Design a protein around this ligand. Structure first.
Ligand code: SF4
Ligand code: SF4
Ligand code: FES
Ligand code: FES
Ligand SMILES: [Fe+3]
Ligand SMILES: [Fe+3]
Lengths: 635, 635
């Protein structure tokens, strides 16, 4: 088996060979077993929204041509897409809401393991929301912020403030004119589920406008999540760490935090440090916390916790034989981990009531008892380490250096070393003079249909050589970090001369041995909201709307409904947005044309669907350069 | 073509012949074109919750056996079902919320077309909710009720009051012990969409418990909808009217109200009466408003507006050639109506922003301008009548007499004529002495897979002969009314001697020429909440929980996600609940076993899946009789 056809990560390839000889089924094996996949589903031409279904429509040929109730291909495709957007928005609803309740508990004295760690961020959020701070106690300010967060989930006398206060007024005006500003986060989710149910909305344009509005409810959840996590756990600043499977250590208790919410992982990290002696009593060197997926990104960004792996290759951490525990909250966890754990010895532990996996151990994690619950969880990990005494493990000796922690505040601060009172100006100067061609955000998942990381690295290499400033989040950041794109030592190899000059000038002004890394890691998937903050700040500084900026996004290997939601809000706020996997929309040309073309006339953004990464890079460059030309700039 | 294989309604058969010779495609033709339907979808063994899909699992045989992410058949089936429940709950969220906003506007002076029509109901709801009334203005009481309604959509310091205040404390306690009381209506909908997204909840029991909780959010929406509609439009009392296509009149402007919300249809009815002279100026006798689906049920129950048709046969009203307008809000409207309108001349008019149909005319309907918007809509209808001057129409001369309007208040009042201060006692006495074997609620849709009305009438006939008191809502009530089950003249033919004696004694005490009708029409689908009120009142009077009462439900020909949600809350509140179509759960035996068996140990209710109606009737009788035996009663 040619493992490089499955993943371009050599550590993953090594574990795939191990899984094969041990007879352990992987995500790639389950994919092979699924081929050929259903063409109706692949194109979006299937509906199960009532008990008269399933209905399907032949992409081409003869009957069936229409759903039983009369639903056309346009309607069916648009309804399916809208439900995916709502599902993504719901995941970010759950995440943000979790943090809002935690902040509220903390400042009410009900969860002493949590506290206001970033007072400056708290006050800045309060001011943005219009909440008074002068003469007010921090705990009361925080209580008001938490109440405002929770209020954005339902209808009230104002729209969703985590949309209207985070985008420039001109953008809010454009969106309002089209009826696209959400009334409430969970309100929009419910309205999508209603309008897409049988015998309701049956006009493609109307349905898709609803989807754009629900995508902004998702944006609000993301931005709220980042805001609240920064208050509770600290705003990221530049950090140095490592990534890939080689960060596991045979002589340590290896504990992966996996899922999404720092409410959980942040405490695991702090408590693990207090349990060092207890781990040593058990014959370990200590507890080695490592990250998977977004919650890994959260603790990487804030604490420099090394990232083990991401997304599609998550099972491979277990295959090493050295993963003593995998601590889960929710989202993007392959439920296969629960059965693979039987083979590998790993203790898989769920912690949230709405996210259990048959065969896992469930240990409820209450914010009110976070430290004690964390100790219980970590003691299971220690017991597991003891059980593998004398057992061979195979940790690929493969890892990269990673510089990360580029929050928007961190980026502005780094730039301020070149211009203290106008920090964005040096960036803009270099866009204008051509040293920086534009900005591309890589975001989102890996997808088993695409050799792992192949689209991210192929596109990033082409853009970097063309002097594009590249930023990344989520498992896109994960892909790029595992392939060396966050190691400043690789700037000479990867970057165009203009971009190199800029990364070097900024790094040198920040007292570094040299440049910023080739790609700036802006955090987890909710932290795509940080990229919004940066872009909106640039828009405001320039006095133009986001759809005039040379900024694009690429979900190069997208998988989750959350990726569909984020991609859709990227388009809604005005960005050309690449998706590198086939979305289930191709069964309807009219829907495809709306999403890739006519939406430009509504929001200024648009999707670029392109499965070939070299071609995608060309299309992204063309989009950046069109923006440059629109600003009167050379390109 | 043997049209009786499609529908057992002779008026529908006649219109099917007309559609055939005119080449107009119908729902039955679109169904035929869809055969054979996908077996993966039919069994629930398909997942499209991420862009790695579509995934499927062979019901039997070889691979694929598991989803790409590791999702088992149990997980996939349970996640799909949970999303259907959430979608149903969302439709009732939208409906109830619409009414809450309307009530609020009315009493704030912003929508003068609306008012408090049922003051007694307003005060009784206030008291149930714990809202003070003494010394308070009606408008302020109503404002508090509307605010309480809107508050139940989100988390707050109390659970959903439209669950906890409408079920007996012992039932609330059972549900609370299992964590099943909703925190907020839209909150639960969003949590379902989150937990069922990729890489989240992956334990069938955990998922299904979540579904039961979300079904109670649906119950709350239903009960809220009925409560608010009764306040605004009046609580139904016994009425006499007619049903089936023969209620259309060639010499009148025929206007169908179709969809769900009385906010719209109630005004159409009142305004149509004011426009009689304008219709006569146009050469009509007047405006003949007729009902389709639930909004038809709403105006039938309150005003005796005749019901034209229901559910699967809705297109047939248009095929007569005499339907001048079809006025739509949302839900259960086949979008085919928009294209069929081109052939038939009918003006199809949408009115709600989130429910448009390509090719229809959209006329926005604002509560703030209800009368003017209604006149605009009706003037389109009048213009349409004028266009068919001299054109032959074919209205089947087929209709039945219908006695309806049996709200729970109406039922209690009718019983009170036998016992003024203990109205429920005569009903209970007759259950105990065997004159009434038990109670069966028929609810829900028709479904093109089942010859229209065949399950409803077959099951009802068997139960009535066995002295079961039958009540009905929605298009189940529609089926039964179109086949004569709401005409008291048919009591001798249909009813067992015991039931006849009871219906006669109650009717005679209410001053009738004779009995109540064979089946009691309790209203629209949200008015399934009326049946809950009745059953809960019986439970409270007897001092036992609902799962000890000889009461069952049958969604004999279910279709919509709303039917799945209602069926699931029927089970959750403790009822044996029949479904007469194949739900997409058979691909997982463990899920099937939970829903049809082990859930008894949680809530006392359970599903009875049975496609053969004679067998379903036997199973329903067995369930009733088991309840009788549990109470120590003969059977
Ligand atoms: S909603 Fe329409 S297209 Fe979808 S399953 Fe039902 S009948 Fe088929
Ligand atoms: S969630 Fe799992 S089972 Fe569903 S489509 Fe994605 S990979 Fe397949
Ligand atoms: S027919 Fe395959 S996804 Fe429905
Ligand atoms: S394979 Fe047919 S419903 Fe998906
Ligand atoms: Fe993530
Ligand atoms: Fe209905």
């Amino acid at each position: 088996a040619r493992q490089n056809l499955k993943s371009t990560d050599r550590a993953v390839q090594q574990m795939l060979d191990k899984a094969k000889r041990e007879g352990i089924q992987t995500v790639w094996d389950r994919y092979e077993a699924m081929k050929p996949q259903c063409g109706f589903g692949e194109t979006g031409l299937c509906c199960r929204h009532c008990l008269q279904g399933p209905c399907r429509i032949n992409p081409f040929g003869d009957e069936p041509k229409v759903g039983i109730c009369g639903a056309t291909a346009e309607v069916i495709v648009a309804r399916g897409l809208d439900r995916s957007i709502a599902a993504g928005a719901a995941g970010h609803s759950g995440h943000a809401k979790h943090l809002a309740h935690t902040l509220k508990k903390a400042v009410q004295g009900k969860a002493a393991s949590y506290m206001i760690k970033d007072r400056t961020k708290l006050h800045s959020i309060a001011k943005r929301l219009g909440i008074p701070t002068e003469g007010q106690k921090d705990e009361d300010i925080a209580l008001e912020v938490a109440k405002a967060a929770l209020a954005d989930f339902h209808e009230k006398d104002t729209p969703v403030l985590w949309v209207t206060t985070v985008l420039p007024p001109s953008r809010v005006k454009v969106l309002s004119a089209h009826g696209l500003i959400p009334a409430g986060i969970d309100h929009e989710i419910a309205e999508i589920m209603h309008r897409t149910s049988m015998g309701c909305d049956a006009d493609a344009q109307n349905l898709l406008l609803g989807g754009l509005r629900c995508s902004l409810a998702d944006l609000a959840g993301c931005y709220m999540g980042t805001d609240l996590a920064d208050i509770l756990f600290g705003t990221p600043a530049p950090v140095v760490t490592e990534s890939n499977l080689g960060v596991l250590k045979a002589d340590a208790v290896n504990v992966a935090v996996h899922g999404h919410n720092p409410v959980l992982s942040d405490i695991i990290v702090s408590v693990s440090k207090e349990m060092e002696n207890e781990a040593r009593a058990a014959g370990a060197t200590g507890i080695n916390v490592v990250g998977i997926c977004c919650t890994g990104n959260e603790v990487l960004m804030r604490h420099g916790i090394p990232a083990c792996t991401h997304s599609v290759s998550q099972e491979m951490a277990m295959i090493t034989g050295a993963l003593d525990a995998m601590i889960l909250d929710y989202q993007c966890i392959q439920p296969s981990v629960a059965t693979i754990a039987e083979c590998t010895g790993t203790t898989v532990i769920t912690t949230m009531e709405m996210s259990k996996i048959t065969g896992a151990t469930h240990v409820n994690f209450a914010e009110e008892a976070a430290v004690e619950n964390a100790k219980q969880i970590l003691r299971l990990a220690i017991d597991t380490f003891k059980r593998r005494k004398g057992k061979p493990v195979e940790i690929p000796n493969i890892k990269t250096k990673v510089v990360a922690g580029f929050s928007t505040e961190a980026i502005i601060n780094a730039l301020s070393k070149l211009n203290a009172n106008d920090p964005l100006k040096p960036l803009i100067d270099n866009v204008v003079n051509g040293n920086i061609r534009g900005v591309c955000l890589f975001a989102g998942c890996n997808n088993v249909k695409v050799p792992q990381d192949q689209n991210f690295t192929t596109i990033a290499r082409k853009l970097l050589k063309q002097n594009v400033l590249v930023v990344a989040t989520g498992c896109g950041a994960g892909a790029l970090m595992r392939h060396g794109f966050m190691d400043p030592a690789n700037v000479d190899e990867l970057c165009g001369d203009g971009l190199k000059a800029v990364l070097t000038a900024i790094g040198e002004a920040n007292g570094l041995g040299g440049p910023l890394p080739p790609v700036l890691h802006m955090g987890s998937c909710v932290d795509n909201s940080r990229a919004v903050a940066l872009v909106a700040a640039l828009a405001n500084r320039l006095g133009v709307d986001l759809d005039r900026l040379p900024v694009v996004a690429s979900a190069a290997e997208a998988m989750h409904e959350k990726a569909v939601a984020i991609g859709t809000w990227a388009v809604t706020i005005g960005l050309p947005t690449h998706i590198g996997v086939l979305p289930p929309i191709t069964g309807s040309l009219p829907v495809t044309q709306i999403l890739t073309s006519s939406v430009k006339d509504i929001t200024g953004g648009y999707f670029i669907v392109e499965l070939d990464p070299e071609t995608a890079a060309d299309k992204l460059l063309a989009a950046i350069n069109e923006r440059r030309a629109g600003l009167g700039l050379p390109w």
